[PDB]
Design a protein around this ligand. Structure first.
Ligand SMILES: CCCCCCCCCCCCCCCCCC(=O)OC[C@H](COP(=O)([O-])OCC(O)COP(=O)([O-])OC[C@@H](COC(=O)CCCCCCCCCCCCCCCCC)OC(=O)CCCCCCCCCCCCCCCCC)OC(=O)CCCCCCCCCCCCCCCCC
Ligand SMILES: CCCCC/C=C/C/C=C/C/C=C\C/C=C\CCCC(=O)O[C@H](COC(=O)CCCCCCCCCCCCCCCCC)COP(=O)(O)O[C@@H]1[C@H](O)[C@H](O)[C@@H](O)[C@H](O)[C@H]1O
Ligand SMILES: CCCCC/C=C/C/C=C/C/C=C\C/C=C\CCCC(=O)O[C@H](COC(=O)CCCCCCCCCCCCCCCCC)COP(=O)(O)O[C@@H]1[C@H](O)[C@H](O)[C@@H](O)[C@H](O)[C@H]1O
Ligand SMILES: CCCCC/C=C/C/C=C/C/C=C\C/C=C\CCCC(=O)O[C@H](COC(=O)CCCCCCCCCCCCCCCCC)COP(=O)(O)O[C@@H]1[C@H](O)[C@H](O)[C@@H](O)[C@H](O)[C@H]1O
Ligand SMILES: CCCCC/C=C/C/C=C\CCCCCCCC(=O)O[C@H](COC(=O)CCCCCCCCCCCCCCC)COP(=O)([O-])OCC[N+](C)(C)C
Ligand SMILES: CCCCCCCCCCCCCCCCCC(=O)OC[C@H](COP(=O)(O)OCCN)OC(=O)CCCCCCCCCCCCCCCCC
Ligand SMILES: CCCCCCCCCCCCCCCCCC(=O)OC[C@H](COP(=O)(O)OCCN)OC(=O)CCCCCCCCCCCCCCCCC
Ligand SMILES: CCCCCCCCCCCCCCCCCC(=O)OC[C@H](COP(=O)(O)OCCN)OC(=O)CCCCCCCCCCCCCCCCC
Ligand SMILES: CCCCCCCCCCCC(=O)OC[C@H](COP(=O)(O)OCC[N+](C)(C)C)OC(=O)CCCCCCCCCCC
Lengths: 49, 88, 128, 469, 89, 86, 184
């Protein structure tokens, strides 16, 4: 419930299926901090079908 | 892009005169001569109007008239992901 | 300037001369309907690239290793007497190793295009 | 034994169904163990540091190479256990961890390439072995081809590793153009004094070292580590590093190199600082690997590096295996599975692990403190040996930078333990399924080695004195 | 050795500053290997030494296998996406 | 190893210098090894002809700086067709 | 004759430069593959000129006959997008391209020298103003060519290398099947 902090105490995201949205794909972000997941089971539902 | 070259009239007239030696039609020396003449409409002559006719426009016709010589993303990738590209 | 080099230069010249004669003598009257691709007299829609089978890829890809295998035997056949019995044993070992890979390819059915649709063989059962 | 296993496996796997995969892996697992315990006695050949050239001087066998080969066998045994044995028997774990049909063959071929790199006495042997290992590693990165990230990673690996393979080949050919030779054995003290080989040999060193991802060419490999399936990442971030570093340690072609000194400093700084803002577990572990690579890079500047290198690489391999196994074990206790290739992604998903499995967190604490270097854990003695080596040879500024990097990287090491010992609101009461006996025993053996190995330190040095002097 | 060196350098620059397509990257790899082999073969001739030519033969075989594997990787990458972007990697 | 083998399976162009240098290194030790510096020098000379090119540069510089005639048995270049003519 | 035939090597070099530039600048990547084939024919020409016609034939057999064929096969089956060379996209590279060209070319010529002084290192690169003297002897009684000698050393002195190469080719079979075929 308290917001996660990182190794330097900086703000860190909490992750669950919310981060696999429509407006957060193609986000401009460094790969170290990018949370969109193109292998997530909710973005890969009908791939190669 | 269409390639245009400007040349001196003497050089180009000499070329067209030389090329008149082959048996198939080729740009004339007299067509080079006419290249320096702009169209001059007689002030007193009947026109398309007297035939109750209305000429079409070159810009609207050009695409149809020239069709055989025509040269020829973000959503497409996402849509492509759902299809099959390789099979057994 | 031996016959070899002269002959090799001469062949493309003759090809180009025949091409030039055809360009010079045949008529040339392109127009839109003539310029269409011939597909049985009709016109088809432009399509995304066809989905292809993996065997099509696999024949071409597997050509290269097998071709290299075959071509690696050229030094052996050009040196067979010099290396006689030792090299004969070595080349046998090399061939056997490559044959294991051939075995893998054969047993995995890697170049077979399987007809996806097959006759239904299920029994007909009625719940009485 | 290895070549035989590769041939037999290709045939057997060709005749086997996809359901036999794990069984086949188990077989190979026990086979490897047998080779380790029945063929071990061959160490006797190297008594008093006797060196053997083999295969018309293409290969070199000594006590150093024999030890590295044993270590690589042990690592392969541990990693293949993770594919041959199910953590749990439920449907989710079947989906998470299923070995591909050809994966075991690719692992064994890659191990062959690594062992050939280690034993390489001629540059043609080195290049053939390097390309064997590189091609195998690309295929290992690609074999989980339902994953978008893995396929992209495999392409990136192919191209960057190809450019670096080209650099290595060009180095070897410049060496040949100067000396009409393909072996480092032709180098003498007189030759080194007479000719300037520094540019050629450093080009070779850099070509090899960028392939394991030292700074400033670190991000591409870290990306590949992040984007592979976790059980692939455990293998591909360890074996190449061992093979390349062992070859460079045994070759000693960069002694007191200014360029290597500067790149080692940069690697320590980048590895320590760049791990600080990471929130993904695999990126954090990749920066840890970068820092430990810098530590080992320091040993390429001096002669008589064998004891400190062997100690460091052994304890580091043990700790790397242990931390990845702990992360794998913790998957059962997390709330949210991110995807089937990387079930756990963020460090914060370990929050409150102590309330679900206290002894798993004790194992984590031991491993983390070993990475930091607390005595009497193995990591402390690895760092101590490295410091002895570098200070004996006058690398004072680098020793200070080593201390600073150790302190800095301790922060992101402690991040894992910190979140892991906090409180979580809904804790585990009971569960009917137990995690596998085999994998838990293997993890515990690694933890016990990290904890109590120091007891054998003086005995180990005594043996080393008779096999390496 | 000039022709090999120029081929290698220009192929490397083409690979690096490629911002057009992925096939150019494949081609630049192949041609860098070709340039290296050319340099090696000239030195082999000037020394009258078979070691250079032996290494060149091995380089040719390895370039073949590397081409096969690289194109397999490309096809596997294509299988999920159906297209290659001008950043396709 | 293929070291020492020429393009025709014999001994390569600089084999003799290399073999004499290897004899030297085999007889000496690390402390004495510098005693073998001339042999190695000769080896590198055979490989790269550096001193020979320098000496030719010197001779050619002095040749092109002379207007006085040369009276010595000369070198004559002939067509390959004229090998053995006259 | 002489004027052309003396500078055949230089012509191959100039053609190689031009062919590489054409590879990188081609609009259609198929045209780029064709210019790669052209570069390989030029390399075969150079190898013939320096006395290695057998390697000319091998390069034609393997890199054009096999590798370029696979290249074309793949670009035909696959959907590739490409952008054209343009100032908007590529003039930004010109400074780095120029610095890298000079530095890499000079260093690639200097890595061959053994002189302590850097300027002498670079100067030796352009230092072949002399002809090699080709001489005869009679010690070789056998008809041993380059291919025969390669076979001799590859199958006896370096047999281990041949067997390891067999493993590499095994990889070139097993791997493509592993990632391009879907089992069951
Ligand atoms: C044998 C030698 C070659 C024979 C070629 C004959 C020829 O030119 O036919 C042209 C002829 C022209 O086609 P076209 O339908 O009339 O199109 C032209 C436009 O419609 C409209 O035509 P245009 O007005 O634009 O004119 C184009 C013009 C080209 O004119 C110019 O562009 C030059 C302009 C500069 C003029 C001034 C230059 C300086 C002169 C100095 C003064 C002298 O060509 C000509 O004028 C005719 C050719 C000249 C022959 C005259 C000979 C007279 C003496 C006998 O070609 C064809 O008939 C098409 C055949 C299909 C060809 C398929 C294969 C093509 C690809 C081959 C690639 C080969 C690669 C090999 C490596
Ligand atoms: C014995 C014979 C050898 C046996 C077999 C070889 C062939 C022999 C047959 C020889 C001649 C018959 C074929 C000649 C023939 O159809 O062209 C006729 C004209 O006709 C003549 O009046 C044009 C004059 C024809 C010139 C004849 C030259 C004969 C020797 C050719 C070498 C049709 O072209 P055409 O008018 O559209 O004129 C041209 C021409 O086709 C193209 O080159 C031009 O570029 C294009 O603009 C087009 O307009
Ligand atoms: C794949 C892409 C394929 C592309 C291929 C084209 C590239 C061709 C060549 C490139 C090859 C790869 C380039 C790699 C980077 C080169 C950097 C490099 O080697 O370290 C240097 C180069 O020392 C030069 O003296 C060399 C100095 C550099 C030469 C001068 C620069 C000339 C440019 C002119 C402007 C090695 O000295 P080092 O570190 O041991 O430094 C010292 C020092 O040398 C000695 O005094 C000490 O005794 C010694 O113990 C050591 O401590
Ligand atoms: C010097 C450094 C070199 C080596 C040092 C490393 C390890 C120590 C040496 C050898 C390791 C070999 C140990 C064999 C003895 C270990 C041992 O009790 O069996 C196993 C694990 O056994 C390995 O998983 C065997 C895995 C062998 C691989 C271990 C390598 C680490 C643990 O028993 P366990 O009561 O839980 O097993 C029971 C029982 O067997 C089943 O019937 C029950 O149904 C099931 O509930 C299960 O719990
Ligand atoms: C019955 C067959 C069982 C043998 C199977 C061995 C598998 C190796 C697997 C994993 C490697 C783990 C570390 C290997 C131990 C090094 C032995 C040695 O002393 O290393 C020395 C060289 O020291 C070094 O450089 C430094 C080594 C750094 C070790 C750092 C870890 C220390 C903690 C280990 C504590 C020991 C646990 C004992 C549990 C009661 C080589 O000794 P050696 O080459 O003469 O061979 C030994 C004779 N042998 C083949 C029969 C076994
Ligand atoms: C050996 C024999 C070689 C003979 C080759 C001579 C070619 C002469 C034909 C010609 O004039 O150009 C034809 C070429 C056709 O292409 P185009 O007309 O632009 O497009 C048609 C698409 N339906 O039109 C072109 O675009 C020209 C392409 C080649 C450029 C050569 C310019 C020739 C100029 C003639 C003087
Ligand atoms: C080991 C040999 C030495 C043991 C000496 C003491 C033996 C008895 C220990 C003991 O009494 O139990 C400790 C503790 C309590 O047992 P228990 O009641 O069962 O735990 C509650 C949940 N079951 O048992 C536990 O709760 C285990 C929980 C472990 C907590 C993990 C965090 C502590 C990590 C310790 C840091 C170690 C770092 C090592 C680095 C060097 C240290 C010098
Ligand atoms: C010079 C470089 C190479 C040096 C010597 C050559 C080495 C041997 C070559 C082997 C022949 C096979 C490979 C040939 C290379 C292919 C050339 C090529 O790329 O042609 C395709 C290309 C089409 O591109 P396009 O779209 O038309 O460009 C329009 C721009 N406005 O067209 C073009 O880009 C330009 C037009 C090319 C015309 C090629 C004509 C020659 C055809 C080959 C003849 C071979 C010899 C016979 C004694
Ligand atoms: C040569 C010089 C060597 C020493 C100086 C450089 C060492 C870098 C230490 C890393 C560090 O400072 O770690 C920071 C620590 C405490 O961590 P924190 O800041 O509270 O947050 C991180 C923990 N969280 C995220 C959980 C809140 O504070 C120190 O111990 C500084 C003491 C240095 C003495 C001055």
């Amino acid at each position: 419930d308290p917001i996660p902090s990182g190794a330097l105490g900086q703000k860190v995201p909490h992750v669950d299926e919310s981060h696999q949205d429509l407006l957060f794909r193609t986000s401009h972000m460094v790969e170290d901090l990018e949370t969109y997941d193109e292998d997530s089971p909710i973005n890969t539902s009908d791939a190669n079908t | 892009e269409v390639r245009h070259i400007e040349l001196p009239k003497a050089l180009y007239q000499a070329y067209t005169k030389a090329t008149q030696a082959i048996w198939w039609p080729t740009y004339s020396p007299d067509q080079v001569e006419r290249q320096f003449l702009s169209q001059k409409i007689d002030p007193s002559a009947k026109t398309f109007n007297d035939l109750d006719l209305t000429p079409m426009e070159l810009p609207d016709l050009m695409f149809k008239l020239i069709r055989p010589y025509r040269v020829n993303v973000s959503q497409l990738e996402n849509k492509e992901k759902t299809f099959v590209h390789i099979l057994d | 300037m031996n016959t070899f080099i002269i002959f090799i230069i001469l062949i493309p010249i003759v090809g180009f001369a025949l091409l030039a004669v055809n360009i010079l003598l045949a008529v040339y009257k392109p127009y839109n309907e003539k310029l269409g691709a011939f597909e049985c007299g009709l016109t088809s829609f432009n399509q995304t690239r066809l989905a292809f089978n993996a065997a099509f890829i696999l024949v071409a890809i597997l050509f290269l290793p097998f071709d290299l295998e075959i071509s690696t035997l050229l030094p052996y056949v050009m040196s067979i007497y010099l290396v006689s019995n030792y090299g004969f044993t070595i080349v046998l070992l090399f061939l056997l190793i490559l044959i294991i890979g051939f075995v893998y390819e054969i047993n995995t059915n890697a170049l077979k295009i399987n007809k996806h649709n097959k006759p239904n063989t299920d029994s007909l059962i009625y719940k009485l | 034994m290895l070549i035989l296993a590769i041939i037999s496996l290709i045939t057997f796997v060709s005749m086997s169904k996809l359901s036999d995969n794990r069984a086949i892996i188990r077989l190979i697992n026990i086979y490897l163990i047998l080779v380790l315990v029945l063929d071990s006695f061959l160490y006797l050949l190297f008594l008093n540091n006797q060196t053997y050239t083999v295969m018309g001087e293409l290969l070199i066998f000594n006590s150093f190479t024999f030890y590295i080969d044993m270590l690589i066998y042990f690592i392969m045994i541990v990693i293949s256990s993770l594919y041959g044995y199910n953590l749990y028997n439920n449907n989710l774990y079947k989906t998470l961890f299923e070995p591909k049909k050809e994966l075991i063959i690719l692992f064994l071929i890659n191990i062959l390439g690594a062992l050939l790199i280690v034993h390489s006495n001629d540059f043609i042997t080195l290049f053939v072995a390097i390309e064997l290992q590189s091609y195998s590693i690309y295929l290992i990165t690609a074999i989980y081809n339902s994953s978008y990230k893995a396929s992209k990673a495999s392409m990136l690996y192919f191209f960057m590793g190809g450019i670096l393979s080209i650099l290595i080949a060009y180095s070897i050919n410049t060496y040949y153009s100067v000396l009409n030779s393909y072996t480092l054995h032709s180098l003498d003290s007189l030759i080194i004094n007479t000719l300037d080989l520094n540019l050629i040999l450093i080009a070779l060193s850099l070509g090899l070292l960028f392939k394991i991802g030292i700074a400033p060419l670190h991000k591409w490999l870290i990306s590949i580590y992040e984007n592979t399936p976790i059980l692939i990442t455990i293998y591909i971030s360890l074996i190449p590093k061992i093979s390349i570093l062992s070859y460079l340690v045994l070759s000693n072609i960069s002694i007191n190199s200014l360029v290597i000194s500067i790149l080692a400093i940069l690697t320590l700084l980048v590895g320590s600082v760049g791990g600080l803002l990471q929130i993904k577990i695999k990126r954090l572990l990749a920066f840890s690997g970068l820092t430990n690579a810098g530590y080992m890079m320091l040993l390429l500047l001096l002669n008589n590096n064998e004891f400190s290198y062997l100690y460091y690489i052994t304890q580091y391999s043990i700790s790397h295996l242990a931390i990845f196994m702990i992360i794998i074990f913790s998957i059962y206790y997390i709330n949210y599975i991110n995807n089937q290739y990387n079930p756990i992604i963020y460090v914060n998903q370990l929050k409150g692990l102590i309330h679900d499995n206290a002894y798993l967190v004790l194992s984590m604490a031991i491993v983390v403190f070993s990475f930091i270097g607390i005595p009497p854990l193995l990591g402390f003695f690895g760092k101590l040996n490295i410091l002895m080596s570098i200070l004996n040879n006058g690398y004072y500024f680098i020793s200070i930078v080593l201390i600073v990097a150790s302190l800095i990287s301790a922060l992101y090491y402690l991040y894992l333990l910190n979140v892991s010992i906090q409180d979580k609101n809904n804790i585990l009461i009971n569960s009917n399924e137990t995690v596998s006996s085999v994998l838990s025993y293997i993890l515990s053996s690694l933890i016990i080695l990290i904890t109590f190995g120091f007891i054998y330190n003086s005995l180990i040095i005594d043996i080393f004195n008779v096999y390496f002097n | 050795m000039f022709i090999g060196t120029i081929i290698l350098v220009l192929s490397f620059l083409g690979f690096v500053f490629n911002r057009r397509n992925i096939i150019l990257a494949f081609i630049c790899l192949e041609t860098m290997l070709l340039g290296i082999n050319l340099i090696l073969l000239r030195n082999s001739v000037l020394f009258d030494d078979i070691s250079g030519s032996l290494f060149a033969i091995v380089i040719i075989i390895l370039a073949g296998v590397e081409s096969a594997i690289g194109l397999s990787l490309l096809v596997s990458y294509y299988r999920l996406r159906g297209v290659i972007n001008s950043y396709g990697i | 190893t293929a070291a020492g083998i020429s393009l025709t399976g014999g001994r390569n162009r600089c084999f003799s210098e290399w073999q004499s240098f290897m004899h030297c290194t085999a007889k000496t030790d690390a402390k004495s090894r510098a005693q073998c510096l001339p042999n190695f020098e000769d080896y590198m000379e055979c490989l790269h002809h550096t001193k020979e090119k320098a000496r030719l540069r010197e001779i050619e510089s002095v040749l092109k700086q002379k207007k006085e005639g040369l009276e010595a048995p000369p070198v004559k270049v002939i067509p390959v067709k004229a090998i053995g003519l006259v | 004759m002489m004027y052309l035939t003396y500078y055949f090597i230089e012509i191959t070099i100039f053609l190689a430069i031009l062919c590489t530039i054409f590879i990188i600048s081609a609009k259609n990547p198929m045209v780029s593959i064709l210019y790669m084939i052209a570069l390989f024919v030029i390399a075969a020409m150079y190898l013939y000129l320096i006395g290695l016609g057998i390697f000319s034939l091998l390069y034609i057999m393997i890199y054009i006959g096999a590798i370029a064929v696979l290249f074309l096969f793949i670009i035909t089956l696959l959907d590739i997008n490409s952008t054209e060379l343009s100032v908007k996209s590529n003039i930004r590279d010109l400074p780095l391209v120029l610095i890298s060209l000079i530095v890499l070319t000079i260093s690639g010529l200097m890595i061959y020298s053994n002189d302590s002084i850097l300027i002498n290192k670079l100067l030796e690169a352009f230092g072949n103003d002399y002809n090699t003297i080709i001489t005869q002897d009679w010690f070789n009684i056998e008809n041993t060519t380059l291919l025969t000698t390669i076979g001799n050393v590859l199958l006896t002195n370096n047999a281990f290398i041949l067997l390891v190469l067999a493993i590499v080719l095994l990889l070139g079979i097993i791997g493509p099947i592993s990632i391009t075929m879907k089992h069951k």
